[PDB]
């Protein structure tokens, strides 16, 4: 029997990326989706299928759902995610799991007492290609990796976004900086130490739009992390060794029919190499449901998702916050 998944907020990654990776998944079966409002509900579900119900404490109490997906305004998952270990669900949240660590270890407590997954949906964890590249630099392509620079920067959002709300989207570097703070640990390891950053707070909305952030590993290998909503697109990153560079974009979400490029530079010779498309989305939502299905949880994400939790707030009490204009 597939996990019998229910959704709670009708968001727009819901429609984009998790709902078509739900409907296409064996392991899955789309139940249930609730929203504040029962006309998008049934918008949703005359797409993807399943019930549709009006408010998220309905779609709780239901019997045929196993598992519950939160891609809920950051600001708004504890409680919800909270609700859901409660009524007996396992859930996959969307990055940023909270919004702060002792947020995060309490969620974390609620499962563990139940036998619950909670999973952070950090979707491009899921995509071959960074283990590729680690590879690659584990074989010693570029030496000794002396520091690495990641970015992901969008152009500005409608009016009226979530991101623009502090109590509800919770700006730039809850939504959106977090991502290549991610990435900074999934390469440079367990021990980042925050350094130094500035975040840019609109003092119109009151929102944080853009930030950079500078970490480091107790060896000093540095990350300079760049995030921002007022800006154009770039995803990416880059490492500097002692005997060459390597880069590559679309990192945190390339489609799913996309190959990456690996670019390498090292002296009087440059190389790139193409890999193979994944679907990272499906790769996520798989892998989720597997670890439902087999109760194999790994310790490993969780512990991930903890240290995640504290750079972030690390950044965001170390920075030097200046409001413009
Ligand atoms: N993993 C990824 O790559 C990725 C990509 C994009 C976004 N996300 C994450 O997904 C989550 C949602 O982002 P999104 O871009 O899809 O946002 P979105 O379209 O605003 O969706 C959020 C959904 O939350 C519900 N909600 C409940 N209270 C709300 C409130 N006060 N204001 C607005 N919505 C409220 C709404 O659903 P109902 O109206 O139906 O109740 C809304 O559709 C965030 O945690 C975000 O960081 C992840
Ligand atoms: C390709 C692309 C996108 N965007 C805009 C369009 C969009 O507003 C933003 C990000 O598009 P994407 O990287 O596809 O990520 P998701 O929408 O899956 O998830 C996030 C949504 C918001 C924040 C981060 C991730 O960039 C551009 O402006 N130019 C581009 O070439
Ligand atoms: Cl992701
Ligand atoms: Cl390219
Ligand atoms: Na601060």
Same mark, same amino acid.
């Given at each position: 029997?597939?996990?019998?998944? $229910?959704?709670?907020?009708?968001?727009?990654?819901?429609?984009?990326?998790?709902?078509?990776?739900?409907?296409?998944?064996?392991?899955?079966?789309?139940?249930?989706?609730?929203?504040?409002?029962?006309?998008?509900?049934?918008?949703?579900?005359?797409?993807?299928?399943?019930?549709?119900?009006?408010? !998220?404490?309905? =779609?709780?109490?239901?019997?045929?759902?196993?598992?519950?997906?939160?891609?809920?305004?950051?600001?708004?998952?504890?409680?919800?995610?909270?609700?859901?270990?409660?009524?007996?669900?396992?859930?996959?949240?969307?990055?940023?799991?909270?919004?702060?660590?002792?947020?995060?270890?309490?969620?974390?407590?609620?499962?563990?007492?139940? $036998?619950?997954?909670?999973?952070?949906?950090?979707?491009?964890?899921?995509?071959?290609? *960074?283990?590729?590249?680690?590879?690659?630099? +584990?074989?010693?392509?570029?030496?000794?990796?002396?520091?690495?620079?990641?970015?992901?920067?969008?152009?500005?959002?409608?009016?009226?976004?979530?991101?623009?709300?502090?109590?509800? $989207?919770?700006?730039?570097? =809850?939504?959106?900086?977090? !991502?290549?703070?991610?990435?900074?640990?999934?390469?440079?390891?367990?021990?980042?130490?925050?350094? $130094?950053?500035?975040?840019?707070?609109?003092? +119109?909305?009151?929102?944080?739009?853009?930030?950079?952030?500078?970490?480091?590993?107790?060896?000093?290998?540095?990350?300079?992390?760049?995030?921002?909503?007022?800006?154009?697109?770039?995803?990416?990153?880059?490492?500097?060794?002692?005997?060459?560079?390597?880069?590559?974009?679309?990192?945190?979400?390339?489609?799913?029919? !996309?190959?990456?490029?690996?670019?390498?530079?090292?002296?009087? *010779?440059?190389?790139?190499?193409?890999?193979?498309?994944? +679907?990272?989305?499906?790769?996520?939502?798989?892998?989720?449901?597997?670890?439902? =299905?087999?109760?194999?949880?790994?310790?490993?994400?969780?512990? +991930?998702? =903890?240290?995640?939790?504290?750079?972030?707030?690390?950044?965001?009490?170390?920075?030097?916050?200046? !409001?413009?204009?």
């Amino acid at each position: 029997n597939p996990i019998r998944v $229910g959704v709670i907020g009708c968001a727009d990654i819901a429609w984009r990326r998790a709902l078509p990776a739900l409907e296409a998944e064996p392991l899955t079966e789309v139940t249930a989706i609730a929203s504040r409002r029962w006309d998008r509900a049934k918008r949703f579900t005359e797409r993807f299928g399943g019930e549709p119900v009006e408010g !998220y404490p309905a =779609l709780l109490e239901r019997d045929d759902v196993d598992a519950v997906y939160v891609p809920l305004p950051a600001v708004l998952h504890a409680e919800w995610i909270d609700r859901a270990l409660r009524a007996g669900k396992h859930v996959l949240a969307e990055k940023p799991l909270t919004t702060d660590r002792p947020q995060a270890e309490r969620l974390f407590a609620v499962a563990r007492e139940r $036998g619950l997954l909670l999973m952070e949906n950090f979707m491009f964890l899921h995509h071959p290609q *960074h283990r590729q590249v680690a590879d690659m630099l +584990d074989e010693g392509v570029i030496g000794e990796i002396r520091s690495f620079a990641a970015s992901f920067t969008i152009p500005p959002k409608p009016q009226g976004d979530i991101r623009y709300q502090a109590d509800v $989207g919770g700006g730039a570097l =809850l939504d959106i900086g977090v !991502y290549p703070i991610r990435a900074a640990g999934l390469f440079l390891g367990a021990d980042l130490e925050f350094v $130094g950053a500035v975040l840019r707070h609109e003092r +119109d909305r009151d929102v944080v739009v853009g930030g950079n952030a500078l970490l480091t590993t107790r060896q000093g290998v540095t990350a300079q992390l760049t995030f921002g909503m007022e800006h154009a697109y770039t995803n990416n990153y880059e490492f500097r060794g002692s005997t060459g560079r390597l880069w590559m974009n679309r990192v945190f979400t390339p489609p799913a029919t !996309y190959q990456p490029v690996v670019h390498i530079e090292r002296q009087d *010779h440059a190389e790139q190499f193409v890999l193979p498309a994944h +679907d990272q989305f499906a790769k996520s939502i798989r892998a989720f449901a597997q670890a439902v =299905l087999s109760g194999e949880h790994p310790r490993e994400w969780s512990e +991930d998702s =903890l240290r995640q939790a504290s750079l972030v707030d690390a950044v965001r009490t170390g920075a030097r916050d200046i !409001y413009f204009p």
